[PDB]
């Protein structure tokens, strides 16, 4: 969905992550879908918090001191520190790589499931131009436009007007 | 003539993230999981101030080296600080038996 | 006269975040030391104007 069929994003849409751009006789403009944006934030905040909060660290002093005749256990201490370093650098790095993929995939799902709710309500009354848009074969006023947005659209009363167009 | 479009947010954010399949992906919003900043100060740990020794080390402090006279130990400390100039230790040559072990046990009192 | 939960030879760190790259030798309830220069986690979406 993101860079898939919908080519780009809107700098004009200011107040949300996902939304709609309409155009009729009454006017035009960007409108952010608040409900889906709010959920997206609520789920990703949970993701960010889960990676952060699940790290419960013990009180530890990493520093140790060994004399000139204690080099073996000094190197054992270094092996313990370098061992934890490698484990943590590797796991932290991959976790970031894997979670960023999932986050960008999550955003793709939300944009797709929003297109496939508008398409799912309209059918014959509007043609899919592609690029995320629906060119209405009829007069769709601000109430008609808002009826699609909240998911309470009435299909049959425009189909006859759409049939002739 | 009438149209409705489905889209997503864009801004002038230049923040790049790395995914498993793709490097340098520019995103609208992000968080840094890595802490790369410090205040550059030796602070009180657990609310308790550290024991700073300055020109003296633990050997010089605990034995009472003449150069460690102007030094006052508190009732408690969370950790001990020595400097790169902590050269004042045993002014009369010899071995401090189990020096490191004493240092470890004195670290927090 | 500052207060801290994690102390480092070059200065105290106060977080929050699970990972740090300041110094391996730390005293206290400290974030785990890593060799990473960045660990940026995407929250928003792919930015394409």
């Amino acid at each position, epitope marked *: 969905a993101i860079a898939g069929f919908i080519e780009g994003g809107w700098t004009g849409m200011v*107040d949300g*992550w996902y939304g709609y751009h309409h155009q009729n006789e009454q006017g035009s403009g960007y409108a952010a879908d608040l409900k889906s944006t709010q959920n997206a934030i609520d789920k990703i905040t949970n993701k960010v918090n889960s990676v952060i909060e699940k790290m419960n660290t013990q009180f530890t002093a990493v520093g140790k001191e060994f004399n000139h005749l204690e080099k073996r256990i000094e190197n054992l201490n270094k092996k313990v520190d370098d061992g934890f370093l490698d484990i943590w650098t590797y796991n932290a790095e991959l976790l970031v790589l894997l979670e960023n993929e999932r986050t960008l995939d999550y955003h793709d799902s939300n944009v797709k499931n929003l297109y496939e709710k508008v398409r799912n309500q309209l059918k014959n009354n509007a043609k899919e131009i592609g690029n995320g848009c629906f060119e209405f074969y009829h007069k769709c006023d601000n109430t008609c436009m808002e009826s699609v947005k909240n998911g309470t659209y009435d299909y049959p009363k425009y189909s006859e007007e759409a049939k002739l167009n | 003539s009438d149209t409705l479009c489905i889209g997503y947010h864009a801004n002038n954010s230049t923040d790049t993230v790395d995914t498993v399949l793709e490097k340098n992906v520019t995103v609208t919003h992000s968080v840094n999981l890595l802490e790369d900043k410090h205040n550059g100060k030796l602070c009180k740990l657990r609310g308790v101030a550290p024991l700073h020794l300055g020109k003296c080390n633990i050997a010089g402090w605990i034995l009472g080296n003449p150069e460690c006279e102007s030094l006052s130990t508190a009732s408690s400390w969370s950790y001990i600080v020595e400097t790169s100039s902590s050269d004042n230790g045993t002014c009369y040559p010899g071995d401090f038996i189990d020096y490191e072990e004493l240092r470890e046990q004195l670290s927090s009192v | 006269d500052c207060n801290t939960t994690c102390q480092t030879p070059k200065g105290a760190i106060n977080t929050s975040l699970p990972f740090q790259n300041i110094h391996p030798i730390t005293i206290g309830k400290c974030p785990k030391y890593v060799k990473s220069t960045k660990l940026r986690l995407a929250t928003g979406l792919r930015n394409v104007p």
Partner: antibody
Amino acid sequence: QVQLQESGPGLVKPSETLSLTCSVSGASISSYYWIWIRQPGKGLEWIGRFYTSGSPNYNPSLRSRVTMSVDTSKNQFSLKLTSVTAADTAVYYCAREEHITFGGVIVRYWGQGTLVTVSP
Amino acid sequence: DIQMTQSPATLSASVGDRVSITCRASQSISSWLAWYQQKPGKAPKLLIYKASSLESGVPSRFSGSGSGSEFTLTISSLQPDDFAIYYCQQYNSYPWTFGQGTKVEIKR
């Protein structure tokens, strides 16, 4: 950091139309949602939001009397409250609505507020 | 819309005291709650957005907690400059509604 400055009559007679103007310097008036907030005595009340492109939203308890506009040339943001009474005697604030973030949409930059009295 | 019920109405505490201001929503507002500080004859200053997240440049003594209905602003160690009226604001849905307010005066 952005400046917002409220300007108005200060005194307006009952049943008349109140006209206020938010002069913005530091950022473009066309790039942001802008909000009006008034406090009477009483606590804070949110009047509504307006954007150049587009579709404004106003408080249901005020919708019939409120109108907002944006002047792109003078970089200004306007409020028009019609048929005013003593209840409309308040300090009126113009504030910027920041773009969506992880927060996401919150008022950070405010004007310094303008007092408006409704009296003959 | 959503009614924001704030407690207490007035508050008087000394320097160093812990101050707690409680806000309640009439319905579940997730974490879409903001805290403002209003100094006399001035515009409200944002302290906490998203129920707990601290605004840049605001002292760490200010903290937020809560989700759903019950929310809490906490000043851990009160300061002479903390004299102001404090407001909670929901931004879950329109219209945005503020709490009635909590006036905090400094005891000396």
